[PDB]
Structures are given as C-alpha cells and as structure tokens.
Design an enzyme around this catalytic site. Sequence first.
Site, mmCIF file in Angstrom:
data_model
loop_
_atom_site.group_PDB
_atom_site.id
_atom_site.type_symbol
_atom_site.label_atom_id
_atom_site.label_comp_id
_atom_site.label_asym_id
_atom_site.label_seq_id
_atom_site.Cartn_x
_atom_site.Cartn_y
_atom_site.Cartn_z
ATOM 1 C CG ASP A 9 11.656 -1.583 -1.992
ATOM 2 O OD1 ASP A 9 10.734 -1.579 -2.470
ATOM 3 O OD2 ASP A 9 11.637 -0.696 -0.793
ATOM 4 N NE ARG B 98 12.133 0.028 -5.255
ATOM 5 C CZ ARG B 98 12.125 -1.344 -5.383
ATOM 6 N NH1 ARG B 98 13.413 -1.998 -5.459
ATOM 7 N NH2 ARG B 98 10.937 -1.927 -6.203
ATOM 8 C CG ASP C 297 9.415 -5.437 -7.517
ATOM 9 O OD1 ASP C 297 10.191 -4.270 -7.578
ATOM 10 O OD2 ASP C 297 8.291 -5.389 -8.328
ATOM 11 C CB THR C 298 10.861 -6.386 -0.682
ATOM 12 O OG1 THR C 298 10.854 -5.191 -0.806
ATOM 13 C CG2 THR C 298 12.455 -6.589 -1.119
ATOM 14 C CD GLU D 271 6.327 -1.480 -1.453
ATOM 15 O OE1 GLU D 271 6.135 -1.679 -2.608
ATOM 16 O OE2 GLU D 271 6.169 -0.304 -1.076
ATOM 17 N NE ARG E 116 12.344 5.205 -5.163
ATOM 18 C CZ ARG E 116 11.370 4.249 -5.162
ATOM 19 N NH1 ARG E 116 11.125 3.481 -4.015
ATOM 20 N NH2 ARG E 116 10.807 4.019 -6.407
#
EC number: 3.1.31.1
Length: 135
Positions: A15, A29, A34-35, A37, A81
Amino acid sequence: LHKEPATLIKAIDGDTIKIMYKGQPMTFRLLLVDTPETKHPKKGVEKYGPEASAFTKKMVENAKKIEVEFDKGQRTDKYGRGLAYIYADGKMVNEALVRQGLAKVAYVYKPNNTHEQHLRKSEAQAKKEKLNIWS
C-alpha cells in the site's frame, strides 16, 4: 481529477510506494485500499502481506510509465505521505490489488472518495470469485 507523471523510486509495501514527484522524493500511500502488511504497526507480517507487496512491486517496477492522481481532498496524510491513485501503464494499482483479493476497500473519508464505487465493484467481484484474502 488529473493524472500527473511520476518516477518510481522504490516499492515499500503493498500500500506504500516511494516515488519522485515534481522532482521530490515522497512516500505515497495508496488511497481507499488496505492491504495486508509486512510491516504493520502492531501486527507484523500478516497473511497475503508478502503477496500484496510483491504484486504492487512487480506492477510498478515493470511499468513504462507511472502516473499519480490526487483526489479532491487533502493530498497528504498526517505522516507526510502523498494520498493518491497510482497508475501503472494506464492501469490503476489500487483497483488491481482489490480486483485480485489482495486488498480490501478502506475506511472512506470524504471528500477523498471519487473512485470508491469502482473499487467496491471490484471488491465484490473478487469476493464472489473467492480470491486470496477472500478464500
């Protein structure tokens, strides 16, 4: 919304990617996804984490052109980010991850939610195909 050219510096996680934008190195970002992690605050290297990470990395590393697309809202988060839709050769990285069941559509914060519907449509497809996260 306009696409702007950018240059890959390094993929960090599923991500998060570091890119050269308007001559400045910045961490970006991926918006609305949402991946799992490999870093993650509390957790650590969650399941499909290394998979989402390799997907993003291959996709942006093998591209001829990377483009950044800001949404209508704030363009950076509280960690500094960049918040954007990232495109590899015309293909949105954020959607590709969701289409493969390697990311879920995130907590959504208006007004940064222009492609929310498109992504949710790909998320329903990946669930229905029972891919990766969804299996």
